[PDB]
Design an enzyme around this catalytic site. Structure first.
Site, short mmCIF file in Angstrom:
data_model
loop_
_atom_site.label_atom_id
_atom_site.label_comp_id
_atom_site.label_asym_id
_atom_site.label_seq_id
_atom_site.Cartn_x
_atom_site.Cartn_y
_atom_site.Cartn_z
N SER A 47 45.07 44.94 48.16
CA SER A 47 44.38 46.25 48.01
C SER A 47 42.85 46.13 48.20
O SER A 47 42.22 47.18 48.39
CB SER A 47 44.78 46.93 46.69
N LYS A 50 41.50 48.01 51.10
CA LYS A 50 41.22 49.44 51.04
C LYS A 50 39.75 49.72 51.38
O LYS A 50 39.41 50.81 51.82
CB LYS A 50 41.66 50.02 49.69
N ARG A 227 41.19 39.60 35.75
CA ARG A 227 40.31 39.66 36.95
C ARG A 227 38.91 40.12 36.53
O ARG A 227 37.92 39.39 36.79
CB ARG A 227 40.90 40.56 38.03
#
Lengths: 242, 242
Positions: A47, A50, A227
């Site tokens: 992702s 993106k 994260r």
């Protein structure tokens, strides 16, 4: 130019994790990482793709602006927040894969390929499905290559309109207070080993910008919060944020 | 269309203060305030004028972009943060009057006047010094007129470039998390009685925008933190933020 700081491994160890944090001090033109080797190991962007996908979508007019509504296809998926209409802001925030798969199909492989070359983005390889290559195709990018790409976006130096770059940077907005602004994108690569979590972006201060790119082993989705938590532990240790 | 909610007076009373909060629900086209009369009472905009001033400065090319450095003139002033170089982001954040006075002089009274008319901004009156009228001249604006102006800025409907509007909205960024984004500008009118504090802007949610404009009596600078604290108490009570 690049310095290894193995003391950051304590933040991975604390959370029974392993991975890399890469920082770039824009003013000093100096990088720091806990692991130079892993810093330069290329993974599926998942992702984090993106960011370039948004830029190409905006520049080709596939996305008119950050208000245009992308209708849910009515297929119930795994993530509640995916089963609704989105704009660019909410699609980025919630990592709404199906919206970006639709972008990818309208962009098409010729233009996707030309744009990743122009962006000098990771290995520039779109082999696989134009609508899933960032999940299970040929594209690979290291933490240090993420920083190189992000620096061009921050300075409006990518080969797309200033407007496209401003809109994506708006869409990347994740956190802000009186001390700092974080513009960033999460990613979770699950379809090919090793399964990793990504967090890439930058911290805006009054008088400097710190670019960051981190990935970590993510065997299950339980650790996804690590994260941000681990990146912030490093930022705090380096006194970049309070 | 407009509803008075006197329960919000509890938040002013708790902090031994008086003032108005005006909310506008963009989706429902419905306003809420604790005091309809004060909602429509016009004051000096003070540093809230930095929003239209930034737009006009950017549109006329007085400001190239949000990175261009405005050199401290070397005159030590009362506010530590003013005695340094600034860009548009830091000049907005720290309400750096001297930087905006220089913008105002380069804009000039003919163009300042034409632009405030085009913006339909408060009483549209720049009488006084071209470089201080928003502090001690003729310009007056109500909380409800602030919201009308902010709505045009949010939708890129002001008669300036989309780029100018995007850059100022970037410059307005005050707070963001996974629940909401606040783009806003503080103000403190001290040069003409009554002394008031302003906070005007909006809360971006996933599915809606809530515009806000608040002012309160501000006899000393001690209470300046109450502008945000009281606005947030109201936003929390109305379940706009957690």
């Amino acid at each position: 130019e690049w310095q290894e700081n193995k003391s950051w491994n304590a933040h991975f160890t604390e959370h029974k994790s392993q991975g890399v944090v890469v920082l770039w001090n824009e003013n000093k033109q100096q990088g720091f990482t806990n692991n130079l080797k892993r810093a330069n190991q290329a993974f599926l962007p998942a992702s984090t793709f993106k960011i370039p996908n948004s830029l190409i979508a905006l520049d080709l007019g596939v996305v008119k602006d950050e208000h245009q509504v992308f209708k849910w296809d009515g297929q119930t998926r795994d993530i509640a927040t995916w089963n609704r209409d989105h704009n660019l802001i909410t699609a980025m925030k919630y990592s709404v894969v199906p919206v970006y798969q639709e972008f990818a199909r309208q962009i098409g492989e010729a233009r996707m390929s030309k744009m990743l070359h122009a962006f000098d983005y990771g290995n520039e390889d779109i082999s696989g499905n134009v609508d899933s290559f960032w999940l299970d195709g040929g594209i690979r990018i290291s933490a240090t290559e993420q920083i190189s790409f992000l620096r061009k976006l921050y300075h409006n130096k990518l080969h797309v309109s200033e407007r496209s770059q401003r809109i994506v940077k708006q869409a990347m907005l994740t956190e802000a207070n009186g001390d700092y602004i974080i513009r960033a994108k999460t990613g979770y690569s699950t379809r090919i080993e090793p399964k990793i979590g990504w967090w890439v972006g930058w911290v805006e201060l009054d008088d400097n910008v710190w670019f960051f790119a981190m990935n970590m082993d993510m065997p299950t989705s339980d650790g996804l919060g690590l994260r941000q938590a681990i990146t912030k532990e490093v930022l705090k240790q380096e006194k970049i944020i309070p």
